[PDB]
Amino acid sequence: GAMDPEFAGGTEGQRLTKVDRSDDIIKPKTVGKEVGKAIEQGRQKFEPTMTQAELGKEIGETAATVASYERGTATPDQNILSKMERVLNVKLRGANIGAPRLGPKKK
């Protein structure tokens, strides 16, 4: 017997990469003592000094919220702390508390 198949050609491309989204760390724990202290001290490191009302305004919270946060307990909504410290490039986690630590750049 015999067989004579055909020939073909093609050129496909266009590849796209995607990043995963895993951020569901449900941990019922207060903001933290050092965290609260660093919150005030880190906000005062602004120009000239970021007050409670101002920080609250920008983060979408009230003045009492910020005042309660510096206390070291105000029910930490991950989304809140995220903006609080990122606006001034500091992190309240690790050993370099109150300093930029994997905040603006996680390198």
CA–CA dist 67, 74 (Å, integer): 9
Angle between the N-to-C axes of helices 33-43 and 78-86, in degrees from 0 to 180, rounded to the nearest 10: 40
Has residue 54 been placed in a domain? yes
Domain that holds residue 36: 23-107
Has residue 3 been placed in a domain? no
**Secondary structure string (H, E, C) spanning 8-66:** CCCCCCCCCCCCCCCCCCCCCCCCCHHHHHHHHHHHCCCCCCCCHHHHHHHHCCCHHHH
Q: Do 27 and 64 touch, CB atoms closer than 8 A?
A: no
Residue 36: other Cβ atoms inside 10 A: 20
* Residues ≥6 apart with Cβ < 8 Å to 52: 63, 66, 67, 70
How many independent structural domains does the chain possess? 1
The enclosing domain of 98 has a CATH number of 1.10.260.40
**Method for structure elucidation:** NMR
Has residue 15 been placed in a domain? no
Q: Six-digit token pair at 22?
A: 């895993």
Has residue 32 been placed in a domain? yes
Helix (H, G, I), strand (E, B) or coil at 3: coil
